[PDB]
Design an enzyme around this catalytic site. Structure first.
Site, PDB file in Angstrom:
ATOM      1  N   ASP A 151       0.778  -1.240   0.000  1.00  0.00           N
ATOM      2  CA  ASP A 151       0.000   0.000   0.000  1.00  0.00           C
ATOM      3  C   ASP A 151       0.803   1.281   0.000  1.00  0.00           C
ATOM      4  O   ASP A 151       1.180   1.812   1.039  1.00  0.00           O
ATOM      5  CB  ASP A 151      -0.868  -0.071   1.272  1.00  0.00           C
ATOM      6  CG  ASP A 151      -2.001   0.903   1.361  1.00  0.00           C
ATOM      7  OD1 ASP A 151      -2.112   1.965   0.737  1.00  0.00           O
ATOM      8  OD2 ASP A 151      -2.890   0.546   2.122  1.00  0.00           O
ATOM      9  N   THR A 152       0.970   1.834  -1.169  1.00  0.00           N
ATOM     10  CA  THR A 152       1.699   3.107  -1.349  1.00  0.00           C
ATOM     11  C   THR A 152       0.893   4.258  -0.785  1.00  0.00           C
ATOM     12  O   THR A 152       1.470   5.370  -0.687  1.00  0.00           O
ATOM     13  CB  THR A 152       1.999   3.435  -2.841  1.00  0.00           C
ATOM     14  OG1 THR A 152       0.745   3.546  -3.581  1.00  0.00           O
ATOM     15  CG2 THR A 152       2.855   2.329  -3.482  1.00  0.00           C
ATOM     16  N   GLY A 153      -0.341   4.071  -0.374  1.00  0.00           N
ATOM     17  CA  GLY A 153      -0.965   5.313   0.170  1.00  0.00           C
ATOM     18  C   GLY A 153      -0.887   5.318   1.688  1.00  0.00           C
ATOM     19  O   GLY A 153      -1.448   6.246   2.316  1.00  0.00           O
TER      20      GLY A 153
HETATM   21  C1  LIG Z   1     -10.388   4.273  -0.294  1.00  0.00           C
HETATM   22  C2  LIG Z   1     -10.959   2.855  -0.230  1.00  0.00           C
HETATM   23  C3  LIG Z   1     -11.559   2.541  -1.590  1.00  0.00           C
HETATM   24  C4  LIG Z   1     -12.064   2.846   0.825  1.00  0.00           C
HETATM   25  O1  LIG Z   1      -9.962   1.827  -0.016  1.00  0.00           O
HETATM   26  C5  LIG Z   1      -9.195   1.761   1.160  1.00  0.00           C
HETATM   27  O2  LIG Z   1      -9.415   2.485   2.143  1.00  0.00           O
HETATM   28  N1  LIG Z   1      -8.294   0.813   1.001  1.00  0.00           N
HETATM   29  C6  LIG Z   1      -7.358   0.502   2.059  1.00  0.00           C
HETATM   30  C7  LIG Z   1      -7.314  -1.003   2.256  1.00  0.00           C
HETATM   31  C8  LIG Z   1      -8.661  -1.588   2.641  1.00  0.00           C
HETATM   32  C9  LIG Z   1      -8.999  -2.877   2.203  1.00  0.00           C
HETATM   33  C10 LIG Z   1     -10.221  -3.442   2.615  1.00  0.00           C
HETATM   34  C11 LIG Z   1     -11.093  -2.722   3.436  1.00  0.00           C
HETATM   35  C12 LIG Z   1     -10.784  -1.420   3.862  1.00  0.00           C
HETATM   36  C13 LIG Z   1      -9.544  -0.899   3.491  1.00  0.00           C
HETATM   37  C14 LIG Z   1      -5.927   1.030   1.754  1.00  0.00           C
HETATM   38  O3  LIG Z   1      -5.251   1.021   3.003  1.00  0.00           O
HETATM   39  C15 LIG Z   1      -5.892   2.418   1.185  1.00  0.00           C
HETATM   40  N2  LIG Z   1      -4.550   3.051   1.108  1.00  0.00           N
HETATM   41  C16 LIG Z   1      -4.315   4.028   2.191  1.00  0.00           C
HETATM   42  C17 LIG Z   1      -4.691   5.516   1.898  1.00  0.00           C
HETATM   43  O4  LIG Z   1      -5.970   5.561   1.245  1.00  0.00           O
HETATM   44  C18 LIG Z   1      -4.805   6.368   3.168  1.00  0.00           C
HETATM   45  C19 LIG Z   1      -4.668   7.865   2.727  1.00  0.00           C
HETATM   46  C20 LIG Z   1      -5.183   8.617   3.944  1.00  0.00           C
HETATM   47  C21 LIG Z   1      -4.262   9.171   4.839  1.00  0.00           C
HETATM   48  C22 LIG Z   1      -4.710   9.801   5.996  1.00  0.00           C
HETATM   49  C23 LIG Z   1      -6.066   9.832   6.249  1.00  0.00           C
HETATM   50  C24 LIG Z   1      -7.002   9.281   5.370  1.00  0.00           C
HETATM   51  C25 LIG Z   1      -6.574   8.636   4.209  1.00  0.00           C
HETATM   52  N3  LIG Z   1      -3.876   6.079   4.274  1.00  0.00           N
HETATM   53  C26 LIG Z   1      -4.159   5.407   5.375  1.00  0.00           C
HETATM   54  O5  LIG Z   1      -5.194   4.899   5.794  1.00  0.00           O
HETATM   55  O6  LIG Z   1      -2.995   5.316   6.166  1.00  0.00           O
HETATM   56  C27 LIG Z   1      -3.119   4.706   7.487  1.00  0.00           C
HETATM   57  C28 LIG Z   1      -3.488   3.220   7.417  1.00  0.00           C
HETATM   58  C29 LIG Z   1      -1.729   4.767   8.077  1.00  0.00           C
HETATM   59  C30 LIG Z   1      -4.148   5.380   8.375  1.00  0.00           C
END
Ligand SMILES: CC(C)(C)OC(=O)N[C@@H](Cc1ccccc1)[C@H](O)CNC[C@@H](O)[C@H](Cc1ccccc1)NC(=O)OC(C)(C)C
Lengths: 99, 99
Positions: A25-27
């Site tokens: 996960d690059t994000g």
């Molecule tokens: C956007 C969506 C379509 C809902 O997909 C996910 O959230 N996908 C998740 C995996 C997942 C799989 C199954 C069920 C739920 C989640 C990835 O971690 C997404 N990459 C991470 C990135 O979106 C996010 C960017 C960000 C940063 C700060 C706040 C909000 C958002 N970072 C992220 O969550 O980083 C931490 C885990 C460290 C909080």
């Protein structure tokens, strides 16, 4: 490996004698895994993802073997829908995104 | 481009004629952008992330320019903390992960 994104980039990791599948996960700045019996002292912490916060346990200098490469870092354990490998370890395996 | 992960992998996109910055997110199946003014029909939809679920509006057939490359896909618009480019557009710009 070279990984195309037609499907979730999942890989096998070995942490604390256990075998797990996790998402490249690059994000994700940080690495976060489903609840598990990991030994040591951890520190509570809250993290923010797309739908709000979750309390996690912060464990430092943990060995993680990802697709065979050995890495050492901070792993957060908590209630997460998925095991995520974030930027803190991806840099260690030398993973790059290409286009 | 070759992008290393020492830093958040941010790119400039243009959508609905507005310039925005977004994360290349291999962990996201979908693309989701903060609240913006876009033309056409949409559908209510709830997505799941870390922290819980959010209500977004889905728009199909939306043009997007990513680091100056054109793609057409579904875009989810909601109260996301960050603009996320997920695997539905990433497969289109020909992006891969290498390690
Ligand atoms: C956007 C969506 C379509 C809902 O997909 C996910 O959230 N996908 C998740 C995996 C997942 C799989 C199954 C069920 C739920 C989640 C990835 O971690 C997404 N990459 C991470 C990135 O979106 C996010 C960017 C960000 C940063 C700060 C706040 C909000 C958002 N970072 C992220 O969550 O980083 C931490 C885990 C460290 C909080």
């Amino acid at each position: 490996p070279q990984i195309t994104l037609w499907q979730r980039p999942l890989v096998t990791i070995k942490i604390g004698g256990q075998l797990k599948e996790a998402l490249l996960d690059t994000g994700a700045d940080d690495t976060v895994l489903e609840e598990m019996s990991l030994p040591g002292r951890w520190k509570p912490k809250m993290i923010g993802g797309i739908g709000g916060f979750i309390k996690v346990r912060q464990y430092d200098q943990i060995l993680i073997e990802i697709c065979g490469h050995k890495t050492i870092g901070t792993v957060l354990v908590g209630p997460t829908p998925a095991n995520i490998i974030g930027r803190n370890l991806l840099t260690q395996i030398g993973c790059t995104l290409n286009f």
